[PDB]
Structures are given as structure tokens and as C-alpha cells.
């Protein structure tokens, strides 16, 4: 079913919206990445999908990723100490 998510991220009309929703959900689930290996691999692959969407539609996807960047970096560094 990633093919559907990839198709949303690859379409210009829905790429920004779906990326925003998916990053907000994944950031809400960021601590779980250090507990369950299955969910950790899933969340990592979905984050990679978002970042490839940022590569694809830079003009709007940069604006989408911009507010989240600080949370992503800081929480990844903070949660890895206890994960």
C-alpha cells in the first residue's frame, strides 16, 4: 500500500497536503521508533518517502518540511539516548 502513499507524494496537487499530514502523524509517533522494531522500520521508510517528496516538489515541500525540521532533529537526538 506504499504505492498509494508514493502516488500521493508524487502528485503535485496532493504531495504537500499528504506530506504535511504524514509528517504530523509520524512526529506524533516518533518515540515509538525506539521501541517496536516493526513500527520503527515502517516509520523510517515513511519518513524516507516524505524526504523524497521534498526532493520532488521542492517549492512547496520545503515550506512543508521547514517547521518540522527542528522537532525532527532535536527529538531524534533526544530520544536516541534512552531508546
Swiss-Prot record:
Q: Which domain of life, per UniProt?
A: Eukaryota
Q: Which stretches are annotated as coiled coil? A: none
| Cell location | Nucleus
Which pairs of Cys residues are joined through disulfide bonds in the record?
Answer: none
Give the record's subunit note: Interacts with MYC, E2F1 and E2F4 transcription factors. Interacts directly with p53/TP53. Interacts with GCN5L2. Component of various HAT complexes. Component of the PCAF complex, at least composed of TADA2L/ADA2, SUPT3H, TADA3L/ADA3, TAF5L/PAF65-beta, TAF6L/PAF65-alpha, TAF10/TAFII30, TAF12/TAFII20, TAF9/TAFII31 and TRRAP. Component of the TFTC-HAT complex, at least composed of TAF5L, TAF6L, TADA3L, SUPT3H/SPT3, TAF2/TAFII150, TAF4/TAFII135, TAF5/TAFII100, GCN5L2/GCN5, TAF10 and TRRAP.
Disease per UniProt entry:
Developmental delay with or without dysmorphic facies and autism: An autosomal dominant neurodevelopmental disorder apparent from infancy or early childhood. Some patients present with intellectual disability and renal, cardiac, genitourinary systems, as well as structural brain abnormalities. In some cases, the phenotype is less severe, has no systemic involvement and is characterized by autism spectrum disorder and/or intellectual disability, sometimes associated with epilepsy. Affected individuals manifest variable dysmorphic features.
Q: What is known of its domains?
A: The PI3K/PI4K domain is required for the recruitment of HAT complexes, and the MYC-dependent transactivation. Although it is strongly related to the PI3/PI4-kinase family, it lacks the typical motifs that constitute the catalytic site of PI3/PI4-kinase proteins, and lacks such activity.
Per the entry, what this protein does is: Adapter protein, which is found in various multiprotein chromatin complexes with histone acetyltransferase activity (HAT), which gives a specific tag for epigenetic transcription activation. Component of the NuA4 histone acetyltransferase complex which is responsible for acetylation of nucleosomal histones H4 and H2A. Plays a central role in MYC transcription activation, and also participates in cell transformation by MYC. Required for p53/TP53-, E2F1- and E2F4-mediated transcription activation.
Family to which the UniProt record says this protein belongs: Belongs to the PI3/PI4-kinase family. TRA1 subfamily.
Mind telling me what this protein is named?
Transformation/transcription domain-associated protein
Q: Which gene encodes it?
A: TRRAP
Amino acid at each position: 500500500l506504499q504505492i498509494v502513499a508514493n502516488s500521493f507524494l508524487a502528485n503535485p496537487t496532493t504531495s504537500a497536503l499528504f506530506a504535511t499530514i504524514l509528517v504530523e502523524y509520524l512526529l506524533d509517533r516518533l518515540p515509538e521508533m525506539g521501541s517496536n522494531v516493526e513500527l520503527s522500520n515502517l516509520y523510517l521508510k515513511l519518513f524516507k518517502l516524505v524526504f523524497g517528496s521534498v526532493s520532488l516538489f521542492a517549492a512547496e515541500n520545503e515550506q512543508m518540511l521547514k517547521p518540522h525540521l527542528h522537532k525532527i532533529v532535536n527529538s531524534s537526538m533526544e530520544l536516541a539516548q534512552t531508546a
